[PDB]
Amino acid sequence: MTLKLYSFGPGANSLKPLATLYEKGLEFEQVFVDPSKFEQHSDWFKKINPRGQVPALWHDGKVVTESTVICEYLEDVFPESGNSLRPADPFKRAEMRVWTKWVDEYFCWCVSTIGWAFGIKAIAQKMSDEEFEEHINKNVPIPEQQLKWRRARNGFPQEMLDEEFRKVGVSVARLEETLSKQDYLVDTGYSLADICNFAIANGLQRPGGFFGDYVNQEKTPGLCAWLDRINARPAIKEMFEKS
Amino acid sequence: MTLKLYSFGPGANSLKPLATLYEKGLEFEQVFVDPSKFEQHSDWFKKINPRGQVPALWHDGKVVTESTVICEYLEDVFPESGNSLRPADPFKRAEMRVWTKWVDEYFCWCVSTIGWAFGIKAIAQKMSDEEFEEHINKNVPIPEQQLKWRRARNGFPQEMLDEEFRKVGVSVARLEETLSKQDYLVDTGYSLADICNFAIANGLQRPGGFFGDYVNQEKTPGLCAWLDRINARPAIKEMFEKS
Ligand SMILES: N[C@@H](CCC(=O)N[C@@H](CS)C(=O)NCC(=O)O)C(=O)O
Ligand SMILES: N[C@@H](CCC(=O)N[C@@H](CS)C(=O)NCC(=O)O)C(=O)O
């Protein structure tokens, strides 16, 4: 392979370039970095990405990081491969970037914060207390992430959780505002905007889940039809089938 | 004019498309939205950008918002005008976006938070207490900004300020890490990466200022030479001269 993707599979930030690769029909080696073994903190992976986070794209010896950047990189380099995922119209491509950067600056983080608090409790508590601290202190380069791991194992402040939940509500209302009126986030059709937002939103509609009161047929029919729509796409089904 | 920029002039988020326009030699109407009169919350400006924030680009009846997006839009639409501000090499253009999104997701906000706390005290306190609250409650659409205005007039929590200061330190160390070794943030030369970071960093080196202990010749010679370098560019001098 001349293209390799290092990631956690199809969820959160990893899903963005994974979906992009399958939508564009690009051949690549799908490398699973196993979070249950903290492989993102392994010496061999930090050689690929010294930040110690996924996703990371390897292309002919060059490493591209940041999920949103990798997707734009794939469109910059393979504009003629499979589905075209940025509008040709520059005004529509601008609108697309407003959506993708909003995922990076707002939507991903409130959902993620709730995920760190409740979602990876088992990984977060695998090691003994000192073994945990040993790993964090010498193998997690990123300070903001050191604190997140500590709070994942030991607890997030309550008022922090309350605020994060409110922002999820804001985020879901914003999506519904648009998706209740059109099929995709930019009206030129399916784009990186949909992919980046789907990366965060897919799973929120789970009955009995964390956000069932926010995302459902009654409150957000637009959002739900969009989630269904993207999940019906052949490349998205292929992504989940082969992961 | 077919191009108009609505902004606060050459500082913070407004500086990014302003510098881009001058670097590309593009003709445009420079429209000053006066923050001392809260014009960003005026009915006439919210018609242009319903978010009630600057900058906003008007181009033939189309409005482009988000400072970083506007710069990319100008390169998408006028790639052959004046200085070229994105690398032609897609791997280098990816590296550029890592820098610009890092401004949007980290660097701008810690600097900005300190700015809201200490910087706009006079505007923040212009109106009476009820007149202040009246304006905030009916004329500032954005919730996160309602709270920022309240904290600008009434006070930010101490521990919040301490943390924000630490992140500024992290931000400045990261810049020095690169600029101590090369002239511009991406080694292909001056780009939107430099402009977006300069928008936040310019002014930090002010003697007797907020961040004099972080940014100076002793601690960050690389950062300081870069600041000087960009300030010597003819288009940047022109920007400040004509603002
Ligand atoms: N800004 C980065 C964030 C990357 C990121 O947060 N990755 C998460 C997975 S969604 C991760 O690596 N978590 C493992 C860890 O921090 O230990 C991007 O969009 O790629
Ligand atoms: N994400 C937006 C942020 C825009 C923004 O924060 N603008 C500030 C000036 S730097 C503003 O309008 N402040 C006025 C207010 O919120 O009332 C962008 O990069 O354009």
Numbering used by the authors:
A (entry chain A), B (entry chain A): 0 to 242
In the authors' words:
LigE catalyzes stereospecific cleavage of (βR)-MPHPV to (βS)-GS-HPV, whereas LigF catalyzes the cleavage of (βS)-MPHPV to (βR)-GS-HPV. Consistent with their classification as GST enzymes, LigE and LigF each adopt the canonical GST domain fold with an N-terminal thioredoxin domain (residues 1–82 and 1–76, respectively) and a C-terminal α-helical domain (residues 93–255 and 93–242, respectively) connected by a short linker (residues 83–92 and 77–92, respectively). Biochemical and small angle x-ray scattering data suggest that both LigE and LigF exist as dimers in solution, and these dimers, related by 2-fold symmetry, can be seen in the respective crystal structures.
Well defined electron density corresponding to the GSH molecule is also visible in the structure. In LigF, Glu-65 and Ser-66 located in the turn connecting β4 and α3, recognize the γ-glutamyl moiety of GSH as part of the ββα motif. Because LigF Ser-13 was the only potential acid-base catalyst revealed in the active site of the LigFΔ242-GSH structure, we hypothesized that an SN2-type nucleophilic attack mechanism is responsible for catalysis in LigF.
